[PDB]
Amino acid sequence: SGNYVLDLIYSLHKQINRGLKKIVLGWA
């Protein structure tokens, strides 16, 4: 408890955002 279970889910959110950025915005 105490701001928990939310930050762990966002840890993956950044991996998807940065994962689909250098390869997605790098081949246009």
Ramachandran area for residue 24 (φ above 0: left; ψ -120 to 50: alpha; else beta): alpha
CA atoms of 26 and 28, how far apart (whole Å):
6
Tokens of 3: 């701001």
Distance CA 10, CA 23 (A): 21
- The sign one gets for the Cα dihedral 26, 17, 11, 3 is positive
Distances (CA, A) of 26 to 9, 13, 15, 19: 26, 20, 16, 11
Output the CA–CA distances (angstroms, integers) from residue 1 to 7, 9, 11, in the order listed: 12, 14, 17
